[PDB]
Design a protein around this ligand. Sequence first.
Ligand SMILES: Cc1ncc(C[n+]2csc(CCOP(=O)(O)OP(=O)(O)O)c2C)c(N)n1
Lengths: 204, 190
Amino acid sequence: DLPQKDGSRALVVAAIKETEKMNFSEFLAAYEDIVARSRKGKLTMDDYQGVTVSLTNPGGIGTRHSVPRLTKGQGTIIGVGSMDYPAEFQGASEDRLAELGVGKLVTITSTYDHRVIQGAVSGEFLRTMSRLLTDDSFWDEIFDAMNVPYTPMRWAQDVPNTGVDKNTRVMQLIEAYRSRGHLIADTNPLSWVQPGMPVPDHRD
Amino acid sequence: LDIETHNLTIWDLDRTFNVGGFGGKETMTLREVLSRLRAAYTLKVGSEYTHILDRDERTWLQDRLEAGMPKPTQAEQKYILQKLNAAEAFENFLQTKYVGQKRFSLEGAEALIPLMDSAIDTAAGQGLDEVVIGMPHRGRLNVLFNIVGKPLASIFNGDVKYHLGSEGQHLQMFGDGEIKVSLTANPSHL
Ligand SMILES: Cc1ncc(C[n+]2csc(CCOP(=O)(O)OP(=O)(O)O)c2C)c(N)n1
């Protein structure tokens, strides 16, 4: 969305091209190029031509979901809604929500041309997006690209406070870092691991 | 290792606590916990193993040490007594029939002979081929007679007996295993 000389807002769609040949680092650079040039009025005619698929974000303002229109030339448009708690939880305590294990959600929509795309394909597409945003391999690939030294947080169900108390478990974590934490420390100025030597276990 | 250092008193001895699979149990009393820890880590065998980094090899040692020494059979017990008898009999022969052998005496450390025998016998049951021994002066002629298996005639007849090498066979009393045993030559330089 770029404002005009008069003042009236007018949305136009610009394209990130050849996206099937990019890693996350390359993708992030390409994205921020389009946003940069738009803010200083340096987009050309070629930037607005050749779009295959589109993305919209009603969730910015706080809309829960939308049913948008599809422009001629394309097959699908994807929409991203709000990342808040549901309205039935918007007056509850942080303490009570933390006890139960209530998370935030995002709603995603797919609007498609029925002459060329069938409903089973559209459902399978949204199922793959759901799996990726909770998948170990997906978050490993992003961390690798951005040079984050730690292991990513993994997806799991909340466990009950039975057997060994959770306070005992937090004290055992403090001992582990004080004893074995040097095994994952940013000590090597090269990104080098000697292939001959054996790697110690650091699951602790 | 004192219960005062961990803010626990005599008044906690008969109260029950969650122990997380210690002694293959979920719950236990402090009295029972102290008994087991003292039986495993404070009698005639002291162990250092918690510095090891691999979790699987730390757990293997932990399980064996906390299960304890198995109760040996009567036959096993009498075989340990026969090896100690032989060890002490040979020390007496050396001190009485020959002179200047006080330097080379094993008196005080006669349990070496049943320790070396235990290891060589365990290796024969695993199915291995040979055991090679290297050692200094102290107890050398005792090891030649009771572990390698040389005759007395061969021992007692250039350089001395205390530096030459030898070969022999070890059969297994309560099994079907055999194994070769070799002793290496060496100088006085430790
Ligand atoms: C390289 C070397 N340094 C020093 C000596 C001298 N030396 C002969 S016996 C001896 C004592 C060794 O004592 P220890 O290792 O405790 O065993 P013990 O004889 O009391 O069983 C020393 C220092 C030697 N033989 N070789």
